[PDB]
C-alpha cells in the first residue's frame, strides 16, 4: 500500500519498552505490541528501540518473516532519507 514518508526526527522519538519503533532497510516498524512475542526475546528490541537495525536484523532473519508476524498496519511507512550515524546499528 502506497504510504507516507516518515522523518528520522519522529522515529528517534519512539524508543522505550512501551513505544518502540525500528528502521529495517529504509522502512519504519512499530514493534511495540510485537515485543511480547519476539522469538528473539524482548531485550534485543528494547535495547535497539528507535534505531536503524538493518545490519543486525537482516543477517538473522530471512526476508519473509516480517509479513508472517507483523500486522501491515504496523509497517509504518518509508524512512525520509536516513537515520543519523549515532542511531544506526553496525555489525558487532
Amino acid at each position: 500500500m502506497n504510504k507516507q514518508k516518515i522523518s528520522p526526527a519522529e522515529v528517534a522519538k519512539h524508543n522505550k519498552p512501551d513505544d518502540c519503533w525500528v528502521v529495517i532497510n529504509g522502512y519504519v516498524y512499530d514493534l511495540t505490541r510485537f515485543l511480547p512475542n519476539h522469538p528473539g526475546g524482548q531485550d534485543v528490541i528494547k535495547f535497539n528501540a528507535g534505531k536503524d537495525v538493518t545490519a543486525i536484523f537482516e543477517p538473522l532473519h530471512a526476508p519473509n518473516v516480517i509479513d508472517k508476524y507483523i500486522a501491515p498496519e504496523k509497517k509504518l511507512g518509508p524512512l525520509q532519507g536516513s537515520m543519523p550515524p549515532e542511531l544506526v546499528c553496525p555489525p558487532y
Partner: antibody, heavy 117, light 110 residues
Framework: EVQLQESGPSLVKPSQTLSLTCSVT????????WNWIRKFPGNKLEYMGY???????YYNPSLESRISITRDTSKNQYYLQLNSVTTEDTATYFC???????????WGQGTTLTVSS | QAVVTQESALTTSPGETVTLTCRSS?????????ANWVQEKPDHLFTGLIG???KRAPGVPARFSGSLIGDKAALTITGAQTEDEAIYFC?????????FGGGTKLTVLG
C-alpha cells in the same frame, strides 16, 4: 572447511515418498537458514523451501501440500520429505545455507533423483 | 507470483567488463527484493556470489559486484576471466517467496 552432503534413494517409483538427508559438518545448523533446491534436467532451478536455525519452516507455495522439511540438531542434519512423487520430480537435489537475507554460503554436491515406473 | 527474467546468454572475452541483469515481472526491483546471485559450473557445482542486492559472499573474487541498475538487479563482472564461463542464476524475494529466473549462460571467450 564446511561440507554439505546430500543422501537418499537414486530411484523411487511414482506415487511413493522420497526422503532426503543433508549432513552438515564444520558448522552448527543452529545458525543460518537451511534449505533445499532442485535442478531439473532442463537447467531450471527451483527453490524448495527452508528450515531456520530455530526450526521455523517455509515452503514454495507450489509444494506446500507435499513437501515437509525437518531437522534434528543432535545429529546435526536436516531433511526433505516429498510425497505423491511424479515423473516431474525427476531432478538433482541440493542443500545450501543462506546467511539469512543475504548470500548463499555453502552448497552441497547434490544427489540425482529419478522418478520412474 | 512474480516471474524473474534474465538474459538467455551473453558472450564476452577476458579483461572486459560484463553486466548481467535481473527483471521481475510485477514491477521494479528495489533493495527490498534482496536480489541474490549464484553461479553453476559443470559437475553440479554451485557457488553463492551476491546477496542482499550488493553483498559479496565470503571467498568471492572482488571482480564480482551487484547493484540496482534501472528497474532490475544487476551482476557486474569487472575484468572477466576464462574461468568465469558458467551459468548465472538470479533470485528475487517476491511476495515472501524466493524466486529463481531461468539463468544466464555467460561465455568468456577462451
Amino acid at each position: 572447511e564446511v561440507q554439505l552432503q546430500e543422501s537418499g534413494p537414486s530411484l523411487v517409483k511414482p506415487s511413493q515418498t522420497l526422503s532426503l538427508t543433508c549432513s552438515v559438518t564444520g558448522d552448527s545448523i543452529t545458525s543460518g537458514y537451511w534449505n533445499w533446491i532442485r535442478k531439473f534436467p532442463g537447467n531450471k532451478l527451483e527453490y524448495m523451501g527452508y528450515i531456520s536455525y530455530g526450526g521455523s519452516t517455509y515452503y514454495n507455495p507450489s509444494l506446500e501440500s507435499r513437501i515437509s522439511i525437518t531437522r534434528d540438531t543432535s545429529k546435526n542434519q536436516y531433511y526433505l520429505q516429498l510425497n505423491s512423487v511424479t515423473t516431474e520430480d525427476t531432478a538433482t537435489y541440493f542443500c545450501a545455507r543462506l546467511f539469512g537475507s543475504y548470500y548463499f554460503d555453502y552448497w552441497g554436491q547434490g544427489t540425482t533423483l529419478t522418478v520412474s515406473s | 507470483q512474480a516471474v524473474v527474467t534474465q538474459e538467455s546468454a551473453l558472450t564476452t572475452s577476458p579483461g572486459e567488463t560484463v553486466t548481467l541483469t535481473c527483471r521481475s515481472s510485477t514491477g521494479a526491483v528495489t533493495t527490498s527484493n534482496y536480489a541474490n546471485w549464484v553461479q553453476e559450473k559443470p559437475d553440479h557445482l554451485f557457488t553463492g556470489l551476491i546477496g542482499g542486492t550488493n553483498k559479496r559472499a565470503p571467498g568471492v573474487p572482488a571482480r564480482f559486484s551487484g547493484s540496482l541498475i534501472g528497474d532490475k538487479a544487476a551482476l557486474t563482472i569487472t575484468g572477466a576471466q576464462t574461468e568465469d564461463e558458467a551459468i548465472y542464476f538470479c533470485a528475487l524475494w517476491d511476495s515472501n517467496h524466493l524466486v529463481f529466473g531461468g539463468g544466464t549462460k555467460l561465455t568468456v571467450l577462451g
